[PDB]
C-alpha cells in the first residue's frame, strides 16, 4: 500500500480491526465528508448564521426541536450543565465553573459514573455541575432518585454506555417522569449511540452524541433537544464553550457526514468475509470462523481461536505481535484469556484484510518449530 | 463564481476584507493543508506516538523543548494553568477544575485582563486557576508583581494582544525574572501572534499559541515551552483536555499549516492592489489610495474615504451596505467615525477585488441623485 | 474609595465593558456607581456616562463621577449625576481645595462627614 500520511511522518501503519477507540483515532472519515470539510474550510462564513443552520439541519435527522455542534461528547456534557445552571443568562455563563450560591447539584446514578478514558465527572465538573450519585453499583431504585432532588439541583442525568451497570438501575422513563415531575431539565449523554430519534423521543431536554464516534465524522458532537435549553447551550460560547472550540469546517463536516450516514452505508457481508476465514484457518494452530454478533443483529465478525500446542504461542502472544509488528494490527482483546481474538471488519478496509493474514502466517513462521 | 458550500446551505457568501475575525470564521485553510488533513482524516494512527511526535515537529519552528497541540488558545490557556497547578499530577488533573486546597493563584496584569469574545478569565477559571490582578488598568509596577507572589500562587501569566493596554504596563522580562526568582512558570498567551521563537526565547516556560488566527490552519492551537511543563500540559488529556479536543486530522493540519508558513507565502504586492484602488476613486464621492501600516511594515491596505456631499451616503452607510447586501463584504471599521474604511487584501482571494468594487458602484447608483 | 468606605465590585475588562455586565454588578449590596472621566482610564470599549445614569436611576442609587482635571464644570451635572467632584487646584489653577457639586439631598450626606473621615481631610 502507499504509505498513509502517517507513515510519511515516521509513525506506523495502522490496521484497526477492534472498533471506533479513541486510541487510534477514533474513526476514518469518509473521502466525500472531506471535500465538505475542505471547501468549507477554504471559505468565510458568518458563523451566528452557521450555528442556527448547523443546528436546523443535524435536528431533521434527530426530530429535536434545535442542536448545538460542539467538538465532542465531553464539551457536549459540559456545555450541556452550564446550560442547566446557567439558564443561559450572561452573567452565569462568564461565571462558569464557579458556581457559587448556584443550584448546581446534577443527579445520576452511582452506576453511571463511568471511566472512558477520562472520568465523566470531570465534563460534567467543567460545565460548574456537582455530583450526586444516586443508589449503589448495583442496585438503584426509583424513591432514591426522588430524594436525591432538592432546591439545590440543577439537572439530571442517564448515561447509556457499555461501561454503565446493565442491571439493577432505573430506566431512562423513571428519569424522564422525575424529571419533569420537578421541572428540570434531563440530561441524556448517548455519545457512542447510533439512535438518534430514541433518546430525544423519550421526552429528554437534552441528548448528546459523538460525531466521530458513531457517525466517522470529523472531530465533532452536538447536543439535541428542546429549543429553550439548547438557546442556553448556544449562551456558553462566550463562556467555556470557548475553549472547546469546534471550528467551521468540523461543523460542517458533521452535517456531511450525518447526510452521508442517512444515505446509507454498504456494510461488509458475510460473502466477503469468508474468503479472509478460510487463510486464517490455513495456518497451522490457527483456526477462523465467521460469527454474528452473539447478542447483537447485523455485525459479522471473524473469530479466530489459537491452539497454543500446534502454534507455539497463545492467543495473548499473538495479539501483542499483531500490534507489535511493523503494521499496528489491533484486533479485539476482549475474549484474550479464552484463547481467542476476533476481527472487526467495520474499521478495516479494502485490502487491509489481506495484510493480516500475512502477517499471522509470519507469526507462525517464525515459531520455527 | 461557483456557489461555495456555505452558500449551497442557504448562507451568505463571505468577502473578508477586515482579518483573521472570529465572527467570520478566522482563516481560509490553503488547500494543500486540508489534503494533508484529509488524508490524516481517512487513516488510523497510535494517537500517543501522534502526540509526541507533532509536539517535536512543532518544537522545530518555536526553538522549545517540546509542544503539545490543542483545540484553540484558548484550550491552550486551560491546560497551560492545568499544569502549572497539578504539576501533572494525574490525582490532581482528575479533580480539575476544583483546584480546593491547592495553590491555585495566576498573578497577571490588570492591564492584560482583555475580553476576546470571551473573558480571558474564563480559559484560566477552567484550568482551576484564581486570577489575581496587579496594578492599575493604566499603570503597573514592579514591587506590585513581587508583592502578589504568595505561597499560593501556581502561576504568572503575561498577556500580548493589540487588546492589552499598551502603555504603563511591565514588559516581558520582568515576568521572566519574577517568575524564576520564585520557582513558578510563566505563561505567554500570544495567540494571534506570528513570532514562534521570540516568546520562547524570552525564558518563558510556556507560551499558547491560536494555529487558526495566525497561520491559517484547521481549527488548532498549540502550547510550547519547557519539556517538563509541556509534560503537565500533556497530562490533562484524562481531564480537562478531554473536553477541549482535537483530532489526529487537525494536529496533522496545524503541523503542515506551520511547514506551508515556514516555506514563505507570496504575499500581495502593492503593484496588484493599484488597479482595484483606481475603480474604487472613479465613483463618484468615493477616494481609494493604497497606505502601508502607519506604524507597521510589509502591509498594504487599499484605504477608501467617502464624502457624504457627492455620494449621498456617510462611511457607516457604505460599510453596513456592504455587510447587509447579498454578499457580505465585511471591511475594517476602525476608523469609520472618520469616514474611512479599508480593505485588507490578506483575507482576500483572487477575483473577489472585482466583486467588491461592483457592490460600491451598485450602492453609488442606488442613490438615484 | 476604601477611605469611604466601599468594597469595589468591578465590570467588564481592561477593553471592553458592556451595559449588561454592569447592570449584574448592582445588588442588594450595592452603594453606589462610580464614573471615572480622565486620560488615565481606557479610552475605547467603555460604557458611556449616560448607561451610568440610566443604571443608577433605575436603582435608585447615587450616580459619583470623578472628574478632577475636568475643565468643565456644568456639563457633568447636566447628565445627570447626583455627586460630581473637581479638584481645584488641577483645573482652576486655585490653592490646595476640591469640591463636590450634586444634588442638594447627597450634598448634605457628604456635609455630615465633618465628624467623621472628613476631619482628616481638612481644608
Ligand atoms: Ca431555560
Ligand atoms: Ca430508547
Ligand atoms: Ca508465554
Ligand atoms: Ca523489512
Ligand atoms: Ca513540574
Ligand atoms: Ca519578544
Ligand atoms: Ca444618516
Ligand atoms: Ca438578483
Ligand atoms: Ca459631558
Same mark, same amino acid.
Do not use: C
Given at each position: 500500500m502507499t504509505p498513509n500520511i502517517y507513515q510519511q511522518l515516521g509513525l506506523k501503519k495502522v490496521i484497526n480491526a477492534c472498533g471506533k477507540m479513541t486510541i487510534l483515532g477514533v474513526s476514518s472519515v469518509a473521502p466525500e465528508?472531506?471535500?465538505?470539510?475542505?471547501?468549507?474550510?477554504?471559505?468565510?462564513?458568518? #458563523? @451566528?448564521?452557521? $450555528?442556527?443552520?448547523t443546528g436546523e439541519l443535524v435536528s431533521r435527522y434527530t426530530g429535536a426541536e434545535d442542536s448545538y455542534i460542539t467538538s465532542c461528547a465531553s464539551a457536549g456534557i459540559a456545555i450541556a450543565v452550564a446550560a442547566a445552571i446557567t439558564h443561559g443568562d450572561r452573567a452565569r455563563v462568564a461565571l462558569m465553573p464557579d458556581s457559587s450560591?448556584?443550584?448546581?447539584?446534577?443527579?445520576?446514578?452511582?452506576?453511571?459514573?463511568?471511566?472512558?478514558?477520562?472520568?465523566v465527572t470531570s465534563a460534567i465538573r467543567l460545565g460548574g455541575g456537582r455530583i450526586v450519585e444516586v443508589g449503589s453499583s448495583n442496585l438503584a431504585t426509583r424513591w432514591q432518585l426522588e430524594s436525591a432532588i432538592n432546591e439545590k439541583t440543577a439537572a439530571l442525568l442517564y448515561v447509556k454506555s457499555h461501561h454503565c451497570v446493565?442491571?439493577?438501575?432505573?430506566? #431512562? @422513563?423513571?428519569? $424522564?417522569?422525575?424529571?419533569?415531575?420537578?421541572?428540570?431539565?434531563?440530561?441524556?449523554?448517548?455519545?457512542?449511540?447510533?439512535?438518534?430519534?430514541?433518546?430525544?423521543?423519550?421526552?429528554?431536554?437534552?441528548?448528546?452524541?459523538?460525531?466521530?464516534?458513531?457517525?466517522?465524522?470529523?472531530?465533532?458532537?452536538?447536543?439535541?433537544?428542546?429549543?429553550?435549553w439548547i438557546a442556553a447551550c448556544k449562551a456558553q460560547?462566550?463562556?467555556?464553550?470557548?475553549?472547546?472550540?469546534?471550528?467551521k469546517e468540523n461543523m460542517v463536516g458533521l452535517v456531511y457526514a450525518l447526510e452521508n450516514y442517512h444515505q446509507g452505508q454498504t456494510t461488509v457481508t458475510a460473502a466477503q468475509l469468508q474468503p479472509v476465514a478460510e487463510a486464517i484457518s490455513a495456518i497451522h494452530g490457527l483456526y477462523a470462523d465467521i460469527e454474528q454478533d452473539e447478542a447483537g443483529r447485523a455485525i459479522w465478525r471473524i473469530r479466530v481461536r489459537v491452539n497454543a500446542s500446534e502454534l507455539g504461542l497463545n492467543a495473548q502472544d499473538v495479539e501483542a505481535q499483531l500490534r507489535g509488528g511493523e503494521i499496528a494490527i489491533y484486533a479485539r482483546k476482549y475474549?484474550?484469556?479464552?484463547?481467542?481474538?476476533?476481527?472487526?471488519?467495520?474499521?478495516?478496509?479494502?485490502?487491509?484484510?489481506?495484510?493480516?493474514?500475512?502477517?499471522?502466517?509470519?507469526?507462525?513462521?517464525?515459531?520455527?518449530?
Open positions: 465528508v472531506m471535500q465538505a470539510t475542505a471547501r468549507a474550510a477554504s471559505a468565510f462564513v458568518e #458563523i @451566528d448564521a452557521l $450555528v442556527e443552520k450560591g448556584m443550584a448546581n447539584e446534577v443527579v445520576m446514578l452511582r452506576g453511571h459514573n463511568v471511566d472512558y478514558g477520562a472520568p446493565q442491571k439493577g438501575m432505573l430506566s #431512562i @422513563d423513571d428519569f $424522564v417522569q422525575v424529571a419533569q415531575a420537578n421541572h428540570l431539565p434531563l440530561i441524556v449523554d448517548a455519545a457512542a449511540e447510533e439512535d438518534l430519534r430514541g433518546w430525544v423521543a423519550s421526552g429528554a431536554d437534552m441528548v448528546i452524541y459523538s460525531g466521530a464516534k458513531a457517525f466517522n465524522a470529523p472531530t465533532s458532537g452536538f447536543i439535541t433537544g428542546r429549543k429553550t460560547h462566550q463562556g467555556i464553550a470557548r475553549a472547546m472550540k469546534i471550528g475474549q484474550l484469556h479464552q484463547g481467542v481474538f476476533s476481527l472487526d471488519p467495520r474499521t478495516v478496509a479494502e485490502g487491509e484484510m489481506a495484510l493480516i493474514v500475512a502477517r499471522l502466517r509470519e507469526i507462525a513462521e517464525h515459531a520455527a518449530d
